Amino acid sequence: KPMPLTLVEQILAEFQLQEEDLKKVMRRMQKEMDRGLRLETHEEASVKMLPTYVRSTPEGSEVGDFLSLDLGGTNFRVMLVKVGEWSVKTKHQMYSIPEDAMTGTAEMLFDYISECISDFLDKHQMKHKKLPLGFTFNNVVGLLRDAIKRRGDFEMDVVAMVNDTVATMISCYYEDHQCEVGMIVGTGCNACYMEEMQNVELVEGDEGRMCVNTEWGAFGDSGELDEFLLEYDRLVDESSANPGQQLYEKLIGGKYMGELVRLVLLRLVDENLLFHGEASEQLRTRGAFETRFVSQVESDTGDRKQIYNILSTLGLRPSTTDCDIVRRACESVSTRAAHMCSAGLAGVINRMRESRVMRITVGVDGSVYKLHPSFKERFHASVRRLTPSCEITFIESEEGSGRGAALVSAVACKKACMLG
Ligand SMILES: O=C(Nc1nccs1)[C@H](CC1CCCCC1)n1ccc(S(=O)(=O)C2CCCC2)cc1=O
Ligand SMILES: OC[C@H]1O[C@H](O)[C@H](O)[C@@H](O)[C@@H]1O
Numbered sequence: 001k002p003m004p005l006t007l008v009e010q011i012l013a014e015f016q017l018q019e020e021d022l023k024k025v026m027r028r029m030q031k032e033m034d035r036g037l038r039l040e041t042h043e044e045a046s047v048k049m050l051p052t053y054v055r056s057t058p059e060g061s062e063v064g065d066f067l068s069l070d071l072g073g074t075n076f077r078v079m080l081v082k083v084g085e086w087s088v089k090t091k092h093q094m095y096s097i098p099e100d101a102m103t104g105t106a107e108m109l110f111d112y113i114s115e116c117i118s119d120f121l122d123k124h125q126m127k128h129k130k131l132p133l134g135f136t137f138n139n140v141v142g143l144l145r146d147a148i149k150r151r152g153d154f155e156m157d158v159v160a161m162v163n164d165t166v167a168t169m170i171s172c173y174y175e176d177h178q179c180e181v182g183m184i185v186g187t188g189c190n191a192c193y194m195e196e197m198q199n200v201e202l203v204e205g206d207e208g209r210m211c212v213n214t215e216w217g218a219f220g221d222s223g224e225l226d227e228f229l230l231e232y233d234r235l236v237d238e239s240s241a242n243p244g245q246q247l248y249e250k251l252i253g254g255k256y257m258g259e260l261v262r263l264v265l266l267r268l269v270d271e272n273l274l275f276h277g278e279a280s281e282q283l284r285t286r287g288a289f290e291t292r293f294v295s296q297v298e299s300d301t302g303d304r305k306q307i308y309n310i311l312s313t314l315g316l317r318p319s320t321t322d323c324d325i326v327r328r329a330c331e332s333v334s335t336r337a338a339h340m341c342s343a344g345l346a347g348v349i350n351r352m353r354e355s356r357v358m359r360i361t362v363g364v365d366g367s368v369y370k371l372h373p374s375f376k377e378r379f380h381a382s383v384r385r386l387t388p389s390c391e392i393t394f395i396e397s398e399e400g401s402g403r404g405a406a407l408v409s410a411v412a413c414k415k416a417c418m419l420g
Contacts, residue, residue, distance in 0.1 A: 002324070004324075004328065005273070005321070005325070007271070007273055008268065008273050008274075008325050008328065009328075011264070011267060011268060011271065011273070012264075012328055012329060012332040014230050014332075015230070015332040015333065015335065015336040016336075017228065017336060017339045017340070019385065019386075021228065022339060022342065022343045022346070022382065022386060023343075023386065025224075025225070025228065025340065025343035025344075026343040026344070026346050026347040026350070026386060027347075028219075028224045029047070029216065029219060029224075029343060029344050029347040030347045030350070030351055032045065032046060032047040032216075032219055032224065033047055033049055033214065033216075033347065033348070033351060035047065036048050036049030036214070037049045037195070037199055037200065037201055037202075037212070038201050039201040039202060042201075042202060046218045046219060046220070046221035046222065047214055047215065047216050047218060047219050048213075048214075048215045048218070049195075049212050049213075049214055049215070050163075050212065050213040050214075050215060051200050051202050051203045051210055051212060052162065052163065052166050052192060052210065052211040052212065052213050052415075053203075053210065053211075053415050053418065053419060054162070054166060054170070054210065054211035054411055054415060055208055055209065055210050055211075056194060056208040056209035056210070057208055058086070058414075059414055059415070059418050060413070060414025060415065060416075060417040060418045061414075062417065063083070063132060063410070063413050063414045063417050064082060064083060064084070065080070065081070065082050065083075065126075065129065065131055066080075066081050066083075066131050066132045066133065066134060066409060066410065066413045067079065067080060067081070067117070067131050067132070067133040067134070067156070067409075068080075068081050068090075068133070068134050068136060068402075068405060068406055068408075068409035069113070069117070069133055069134070069135050069136070069144070070136045070137070070402065070405055071113075071135065071136070071137055071140065072137070073097075074096065074097050075094055075095060075096045075097055076094075076095055076097065076113060076116075077092050077093070077094055077095075077402060078092060078093050078095065078116055078117055078120040079091070079092035079093075079402060079405075079406060079409075080092070080120070080124060080126065080131075081406045081409060081410060083410050086407075086410070088174075088403055088406050088407060088410065090401075090402065090403065090406050091124070092402060093116075093120055093123075095113075095116045097109070097112075098112055106143055107143065107146070107147065110143045110144055110146065110147035111147050111150060111151075113144065113147065114144070114147040114148055114150070114151050115151075117133075117148075117154075117156075118151065118153060118154055121154055127153070127154045128154075130155045130156065130157065131156060131157075132156070132157045132158075132159050132413040132416060132417070133156050133157065133158045133159065133409075133413075134159050134161075134408065134409025134410070134412040134413050135158070135159075135161050135409075135412075136161075136167065136405045136408050136409060137164070137167075138161075140161075141158050141159075141160060141161060144158045145158045157413075157416070159412050159413050159415075159416035160412065160415075160416055161412065162408065162411070162412050162415075163190070163192065163213045164184050164186075164190070164365070165182040165183060165184050165190045165191055165192040165213060165214075166182055166192050166211055166213060167182070167397075167408045168182035168183065168184060168192075168363045168364065168365040168397050169181060169182025169192055169193075169211065169363045170182070170404070170407055170408045170411050171363065171397050171404030171405060171407060171408050172361065172363025172364075172395050172396075172397055172404065173361075173363065173407070174403055174404040174407045175395065175398075175400075175404060176361045176363075176393065176395055178359060178360060178361040178393065179361040179362070179363045179395065180193060180194040180209075180352070180360060180361065181193040181194070181345075181348060181349070181352075181360065181361075181362040181363065182211075182362075182363045182364075182365075183345060183362060183363070183364045183365075183366075183369075184364075184365050184366045184369075185252065185253070185254075185337075185341055185364065185366040185368040185369040185375070185379075186253070186254060186365070186366030186367045186368060186369075187253055187254045187255045187366075187367070188217055188246075188249050188253045188255060189216070189217055189248070189249050189252040189253045189341060189344075189366070189368075190213070190214065190215060190216060190217055190249075191214050191216060191344065191345060191348055192211050192212060192213045192214060193211070193212060193214070193348050193352060194209040194210070194211055194212075194352075195209060195210055195211070195212040195352075195355075196209060196355045196356075197209060197210055199355065200212060214344075214348070216248060216344055217246045217248055217249030217253070218245065218246055218248070218249075219247065219248035219344070220246075220247025220248045220250075221244070221245070221247070224247075225247050225248060225251065228251075228340075229247075231263075231267075232260050232263040232264055232267070233247075233250065233251060233260070235263055236250060236256050236259055236260060236263070237250060239286065240256075248340070248344070251336070251337060251340045252337045252340050252341045252368075253368070254291040254366075254367055254368045255291070256291075257291045257294050257333060257334070257337060257368070258287075258289040258290045258291035258292075258293055258294055259286070259287065259289065260333045261289050261293070261294055261326075261329055261330055261333050262283065262286075262288060262289035264329045264332070264333065265279075265283065265289070265326065265329060266279060266283065266284070268325060268329065269283075273325065274322055274325050274326075275316055275317075275318065275322055279316075280314055280315035280316050281315060282313075282314040282315045283314050283315070283316065288314060289314070291367075291368075292371075293310045293330075294330045294333065294334060294372065295371050295372040295373065296310055297310060297326055297327055297330040298327065298330050298331060298334060298372060298373040298374065299373055300323075300327060304320055304323040304324070307323040307326055307327060308323060311323065311326065331374075334372055334374070334375055334378075335374075335378055337368070337375070338375050338378040338379040338382060339378070339382050341379055342378075342379050342382035342383040342386060343382075343386065345362070345379075345383050346382075346383050346386035346387050349362075349383070349387045349390050349392065350386075350387060350390075353387075353389065353390055357389050357390075357391075358389065358390045358391070359390075359391045359393075360390060360391070360392055360393070361392075361393045361394075361395060362392055362393070362394050362395070363395055363396075363397060364376075364394055364395070364396055364397070365396065365397040369396075370396065376394070380392075380394055
């Protein structure tokens with residue numbers, strides 16, 4: 001690797017977070033999580049710590065058979081699941097989303113999904129059963145319900161979905177029974193974890209554990225992050241749909257990562273350190289630097305082809321130095337995101353540790369975590385540094401055979417049943 005530019009590195013150094021900084025964010029997160037959990041403070045808490053009603057014990061035992069509907073991009077799976085004494089047996093069919101039912105209404109698409117569900121039920125002689133249906137991957141539940149009603153020929157309880165963090169935890173638990181945390185680092189960022197029932201003040205009872213959905217993206221409301229915000233973060237915040245809100249998620253999620261990078265590049269441009277002080281019109285356009293471009297730049301093999309390709313698409317004619325500066329800018333933003341995210345997770349893991357040496361599996365999903373080079377590794381290394389006396393295993397949500405997803409639907413249907 002070459003000797004970096006001093007003046008560029010001084011700007012990029014703004015993004016560094018020291019261990020003392022990360023510990024400070026973590027402690028602050030821990031106090032907000034405490035507020036969220038307590039009856040007295042829950043309403044005013046910015047970090048809601050929502051009880052998910054997913055308990056550490058097998059509940060809703062009368063739910064034996066159910067439908068699982070896995071909705072993807074251009075198709076969907078209809079799966080019949082039987083749960084026994086767990087013995088998760090599945091059968092399924094794949095269906096293709098109609099090619100024209102992407103011009104017409106959301107309502108017409110669900111009539112088609114309904115029809116496929118009916119076909120599956122006919123095939124396995126299950127049309128009469130009043131099966132619950134769990135959805136895997138917001139108001140799709142409402143749309144499916146309406147479309148089944150619209151049909152009348154079979155009866156069904158489309159159950160509430162679980163939050164994506166909870167689905168991540170559950171599906172990962174299927175492959176590793178030590179999984180007690182689910183985390184998403186995608187467009188948004190959130191975590192759920194198995195909390196001691198005594199600490200879940202919003203639910204009566206002291207026995208076992210319940211999954212708590214932190215909704216930690218809202219952290220930062222009270223200025224918990226203000227000392228870590230850079231100019232780019234303030235600009236992103238001011239231009240967002242919700243200024244002053246979701247400050248934490250704004251530092252981490254893919255929704256704004258590309259925008260952060262874009263703003264860094266324009267700073268460098270204006271300091272005459274990049275593109276010889278000349279930005280293109282696409283670069284000057286809000287949202288033009290896509291988050292995927294950050295991972296693409298970071299994927300560059302060393303030849304600068306991927307970077308040149310991205311930057312040329314933005315109407316730039318970058319030198320090799322320009323390409324290298326953009327890379328480092330993408331890395332600084334990504335690394336800062338991984339560090340901020342690690343302080344949140346460390347906060348959860350440390351709290352869990354008090355509440356009992358601790359071995360724990362963390363289930364993780366999301367485009368940023370899965371697809372950004374070195375995000376996950378920097379994230380792991382940082383989390384581990386902040387959690388001494390914890391051994392943390394990280395696993396990804398991987399579709400496999402659809403059994404983790406069957407389990408998600410099982411739990412969601414059982415929870416619904418348990419909740420009347
Ligand atoms: O069903 C559950 N919880 C529910 N709340 C409400 C309705 S249903 C939980 C959810 C998990 C708990 C821990 C983290 C991930 C999810 N659940 C799911 C499978 C098994 S199990 O069947 O694997 C068992 C049988 C032998 C040992 C474990 C045990 C269990 O408690
Ligand atoms: O998708 C990750 C997360 O994005 C946003 O933070 C949503 O509020 C949250 O519920 C979800 O878990």
